[model samples]
Target chain A: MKQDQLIVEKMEQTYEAFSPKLANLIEALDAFKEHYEEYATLRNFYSSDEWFRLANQPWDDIPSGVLSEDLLFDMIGDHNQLAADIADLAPIMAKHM
Target chain B: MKQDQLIVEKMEQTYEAFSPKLANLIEALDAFKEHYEEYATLRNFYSSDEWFRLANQPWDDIPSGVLSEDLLFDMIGDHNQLAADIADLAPIMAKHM
Candidate 1:
């Protein structure tokens, strides 16, 4: 499987492990995952320059609260952290390949 | 310094690293830290059996939502995970001592 596919699968498994007490939080996380898929699709369609510009730009410059919602705050923060980690590693992964 | 003190200091440092964009979330986390401190104090005062009972009992047996505020949900989840990891290591640490 592709690296991105592997990362997404790992994330899906993590989300599935949440307890029943966290059902509402899990629902919000599912929605956030959909948003991440949309972003990933857009990034894949864009040229390299466009993708770099979109990803590197200050988050505040984007419309405020694009990914911020009360119910989804924790999941969104974790998603962003994961995305940033992936972006950081992408260059090294590509170089070795 | 004691191990618990070191852990608390590291958590404080992590919380301090959040950006201005997360000020509200930071505030909520501060409150949650206070709650954790209270729990720690109570645990310190309890007998070993009582502490064990409190920590091991099914969470559902406790009043609902004791640690489930929307604002603190993410931080609480992370805190609980950290606490569990610490608990898992405690016996090994005690054995070495």
Candidate 2:
């Protein structure tokens, strides 16, 4: 019960602690969602005959920038970082809750 | 000049729009950042000889989930979606800027 009260108090305190960055955060969240659609579209197409090819062979010779392993993986890595960033905030907010 | 004024107007409008969800966005952003740190740490550890062995062979036999290509790619794919989501927000915010 005490911890719950502390959580509520923390939440109330932060409610008034405005951040100019809040706008940035909202923008980032929206951007993250849009990029997700692209990622999903690509993933569905990843192993398609036009992309992954017969053997999932690394040397399948991608015909476009979209299919380049390095590019895809690097993009994927960036996405990974973004998500971790999302997950990390949960605890802090919980602390405040 | 007109475009700039429009942008300013748009931004002002959104600023006053007042999302009850703004708090959620801030929390999500912080989470994303923390997860990013973890992703970076793991990425640094990815190609280490201990992880990716000189054989460069897929069968190099990943002894753990951390090294499994399937697990890694799925994680990477999720990250990709997250980034697209972030990127998509850019133009929206710009219009409001």
Candidate 3:
């Protein structure tokens, strides 16, 4: 929340700060990263142990006949990394801007 | 905020309720929707009009030499639509669950 508050606040100001044209892009990227933090923390609540067990329990809405926990987990991880990478762009572009 | 509070509470309950294995996925999807709300509103402060003008102003950090307002605009739109599609998934999967 602190980092998010920081980014959100800065971006809010950035819209007013005429020089920082790339600020909101960075803001969005940071939020994208923050989501990774929350997502991982969330996974702790419904851990792999739960996922493993839930797979055993019957649920009609479960999207797949055979779920791959690894696949879902990996997708989230991919987005996390991607956000981090994009966030780096702001600083680089800032030097040029 | 009301919708957010409702979804957050229900999903919190959902984690506790035991049978609804798909709860958090829906929670995450709704949050995905929530982000779309925030992102769009953010754009309002820094509207297309601002973006158009900002393009006129010099910024080294902009990822493109000649930024395409349409591309950036469309990218955000695509994600917003994607999130909406995902939000739809919860109810559909819920019926089966």
Candidate 4:
């Protein structure tokens, strides 16, 4: 009986601590959703032909890393998925908040 | 000749603007690398049997999201990849920095 009571108390503490953390997560999702539009705009610019054309030009001043095909595309893909994940998670987490 | 000057000036501006941003990116990578140790520690904890033992217990107060099989694993995988990406990018960025 005493062990069970201790377990129950620990669980209660977990529950109490979790509420604020959940709120923080929900707030993060909200912030992500709010900034997503700007993110999309930057994504679009990066994906555009203009960016590629300029980046492809043999300009001495062009940033070398800007043309890193693999890393740039990987980051872009990751950010897109992050946005999707945030959208999927927002409503579900909101209910808990 | 006038158009070429404008283009040359624009390229110079781009080069100038990019240096600070590249420094910022390098700074960010350094910060991420610094925190990676703590992240790995957390990752190890999450992957441990003890975390699963506590999370799997039929406790009503357990956070609902703790048991999210897909999201938790997905995040773990993403973080692992992020660390790898940072490692790969760090040296290359450092040379430019």
Candidate 5:
């Protein structure tokens, strides 16, 4: 199972704390999930060899005004960072897991 | 000038109405502009034949999971509808124009 799924499961096992830290952790987890979902979507689409070719093809051949690689890269990077951070928090969430 | 730009300018010229209708219209226009920007980006990227090729090429060739067409289409469609609604409001905004 994914680390995120594991963390969530662990959290479910723990007692609910109304503490600010817990609240903040929950909020962060929510954001992380959102980013993960976006990443997953892109990853899924790119999984197809045809789709991968399409994404990397020369700009002139594609439709007018598609998203730039820079933008996509930035989003991907952000998601990655978020995922890592979530991983770091695993111990904290582990208590709850 | 773009209809949206024109509307914005007109809105600036008009007296600020605290009316809920005006507020809602303004909010809606903001959303429309955001959607337009996204569409413009895609259109620009796709302008290049090479890029179009990339976007349409086999998914497997690209990186792991990228976004799906359905999701992109949904966003694009939603933005289009928002743009149209904003256009319809042009006459109303014309008073301020």
Candidate 6:
């Protein structure tokens, strides 16, 4: 029993060091879940044809900002990519939680 | 010794079921990390003045898609939101992996 004390002490030290890292990570995951719906809604909205219809209208009905092809494609691509990312990352994060 | 075999057998069953789920989740996380840079670049681009400058430009230099304020705002908001999501989720996911 006396000889085994060192092993227990080492575990306690490791636990102390690891505790906050674990708690902080858990908190971060909780925040992600809290914001998930907004992420989905924004993604869905951007991917829809409604966005394109708005884009199709003349400058009389639209902002000049509508002209950048890079912005348009990036918006669609980024949102879609995030949807893929959330699909991939969320299950793993949930498992740990 | 005979009674302990039941405990061992049950543990094996649980382990067998859990193994694939864990492996699948690990794979998913790997995919997210693999795509993280593209995510960041898109997010950063949408948030920058370059996007606004393009937005400010005339129709000749821009595409019709850039005119929709809805698209512009949504693109910015969505990318920024995903940045937050990744920040929140990545540490937790990495821990498990």
The most accurate candidate by lDDT is 4
lDDT on C-alpha atoms for all candidate structures? 0.35, 0.43, 0.39, 0.43, 0.35, 0.43
Residue-wise lDDT of candidate 4 within B1-97, one digit each (tens)? 3554464455444434433443343344334433333333344444567556655676655444534445345545555443343344334323321
Which stretches of model 2 miss by more than 4 angstroms? A1-18, A47-49, A53-63, B1-97
Q: Which residue ranges in model 3 land beyond 4 Å of their true spot? A: A1-97, B1-37, B45-47, B60-71, B87-91
Q: What is the TM-score of each candidate against the true structure?
A: 0.21, 0.34, 0.30, 0.38, 0.27, 0.29
lDDT of 6 by residue, B10-95 (tens): 43344334333433433444444544333333334343665565446554433334333454345445434444665565554343
- Give each model's clash number: 0, 24, 6, 0, 64, 7
Q: What share of the true interface contacts does each candidate keep?
A: 0.00, 0.04, 0.00, 0.00, 0.00, 0.00
**Model 6: pairs clashing at backbone N, Cα or C within 3 Å:** A65-B55, A65-B66, A66-B66, A66-B67, A67-B62, A67-B63, A67-B66
Q: For residues A1-97, could you state the per-residue lDDT of candidate 6 as single tens digits?
A: 3433443344334433433333343344444454333333333433356545544545443333323334434544543444465556555434322
B1-97 per-residue lDDT for model 5 (tens digits): 2443443333323212212222343333334323332334343332355444444645443321112334334433443443343344334323321
User: How would you encode candidate 2's per-residue C-alpha lDDT over A1-97 as one tens digit per residue?
Assistant: 3443453344333322322233355455664443333344443443456454422434433334444456444544454554554445444433321
DockQ for every model, please: 0.02, 0.03, 0.04, 0.04, 0.01, 0.01
In candidate 4, stretches whose alpha carbon ends up further than 4 angstroms from where it belongs are A1-97, B1-4, B62-67, B87-97
Error of 6 at A57 (Å): 77
- Root-mean-square deviation of every model: 22.8, 23.4, 17.5, 13.8, 27.2, 28.7
lDDT of 3 by residue, A52-93 (tens): 654455544543322334644544444444334334423432
lDDT by residue (tens digit), candidate 5, A1-97: 2543443333223212212222343333334333332334343333355444544555444421112334334434444443343344334223321
Positional deviation of residue A72's Cα in model 6 after best superposition, in angstroms: 50
Q: Write the per-residue lDDT of candidate 1 for residues B1-97, one digit (tens) a residue.
A: 2543443344334333333223333343234333332333322323444334433445534422222223134533543553443344334323322
lDDT of 5 at B32: 34
Which TM-score value belongs to model 3?
Answer: 0.30
lDDT pick, better of 2 and 4: 4
